[PDB]
From a paper:
[name], Malignant Brain Tumor domain-containing protein 1, is one such PcG protein. [name] is a four [name] repeat protein comprising 628 amino acids. It contains a FCS-type zinc finger at the N-terminus with putative regulatory function and four [name] repeats at the C-terminus. The [name] (Malignant Brain Tumor) repeat is a structural motif of ∼100 amino acids that is conserved from C. elegans to humans and exists as tandem repeats.
To investigate the crystal structure of the four [name] repeat fragment of [name] and characterize its histone binding specificity, we cloned and purified a human [name] fragment composed of all four [name] repeats (residues 130–566). MBTD1130–566 crystallized in the orthorhombic space group P212121 (a = 70.31 Å, b = 100.90 Å, c = 135.30 Å) with two molecules in the asymmetric unit. In the [name] structure, each molecule contains four [name] repeats that exhibit irregular rhomboid architecture. A narrow channel runs through the middle of the structure and is filled with water molecules. Consistent with previously reported [name] repeat structures, each [name] repeat contains an extended “arm” which packs against a globular β subunit core of the preceding repeat. The residues involved in intermolecular hydrogen bond interactions between the two molecules in the asymmetric unit are conserved throughout the whole [name] repeat family, possibly implying that [name] functions as a dimer unit. Although the four [name] repeats of [name] have similar three-dimensional structures and high sequence identity, only the fourth [name] repeat (MBT4) contains the semi-aromatic cage, which is formed by the loops between the first and second strands and the third and fourth strands of the β- barrel core domain and constitutes the binding site for methyllysine residue, analogous to L3MBTL2. The binding pocket of the [name]-MBT4 is shown in Figure 4, where an open cage in [name] is formed by aromatic residues Phe526, Trp529, Tyr533, negatively charged Asp502, and Leu508. Interestingly, Arg325 from a symmetry related molecule is inserted into the binding pocket, mimicking the methyl-lysine binding in L3MBTL2. The arginine residue 325 is stabilized by a salt bridge with the pocket residue Asp502, and cation-π and van der Waals and interactions with the aromatic cage residues.
Numbering used by the authors: 12 to 56, 61 to 223, 233 to 295, 297 to 432
Write the structure that this text describes.
Amino acid sequence: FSWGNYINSNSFIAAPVTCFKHAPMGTCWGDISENVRVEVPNTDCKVFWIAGIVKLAGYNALLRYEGFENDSGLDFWCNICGSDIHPVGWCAASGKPLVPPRTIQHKYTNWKAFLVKRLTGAKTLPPDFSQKVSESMQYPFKPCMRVEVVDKRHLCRTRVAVVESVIGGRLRLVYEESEDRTDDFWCHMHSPLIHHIGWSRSIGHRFKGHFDTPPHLFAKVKEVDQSGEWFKEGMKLEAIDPLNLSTICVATIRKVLADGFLMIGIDGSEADGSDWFCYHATSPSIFPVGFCEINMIELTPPRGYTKLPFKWFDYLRETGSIAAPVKLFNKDVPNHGFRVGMKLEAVDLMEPRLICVATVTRIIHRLLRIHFDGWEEEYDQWVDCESPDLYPVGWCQLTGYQLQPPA
């Protein structure tokens, strides 16, 4: 399985790296494009020649050695953030030889002349590109750093986890009181699920050579004024079910915490309080009553609720409750860049260990429907467009993470 062949067999389109602000180089890609030329090794000949970008898919570039024109006989895919890609001028700056592919060595006669003619004015890689690449992959979370994280088996409490590995900004955490042999939690270092040691007590969230994580390293949460009209216990809303990212569910505000966090319960599936999960009020995972109907999204009603189809108006009268007002959910919709059909590499939020060949299949504003290629649609997930659990084609190869293929 190659992303290159997959994308070529089917003329697929990859989300540009630019859609993923949290990924390596997600902020430094603005001048990468088709017909950028680079210096890369000449495999047809230890030495280098010029290649132009025929096709760009996430981090992956389809390159054609200069002098080939429309002949794709030796086009080859590679990772533009990989270690043998250099800007035009790198050989000359290092005193290295530019040597033509054996295949077109006789196609043109005057090579120096030919390179002045082709490269004069050429777009190439930003300067400092290779330093920026290399800074990109230097993550601030280290092994042995302790964090607070949601308890997989008891969502309403945090427990303490320790970073055992970093791969590509993703952390494999291990619970400090492990309850089985292989007792990890995989998440991005910008996950909204991890917090400084002392977070739970500070905010009123329940809780069950290592050192505390420097509090400054955590993703910043948007500041909210919760002192006028706010959420209040018993208000209804819709919420992506944390145990089932395929579904948006009928839900209720169960606790209003400090700093804007909310304990939310899925009606029909609530124990004691142990199933409450914590979303920030600005979370893209909760929506007002009506969101689903107005947008043609399957709303999942409470377990055991028989009067179908579900009607909110009836459920409000029955449970004697009100909708959280729509204004409480206002938030920007970034111009995220994603388009239906777009390929990318996604985390399977039901088994986060796995990162998978995937496609965006619906966009409702900032909300994406993510499909895992080759698998059942039933298991498509709802994910925000700024999720830190989405990545560009090539990210696995770049960081050394194992990629699951389709099907």
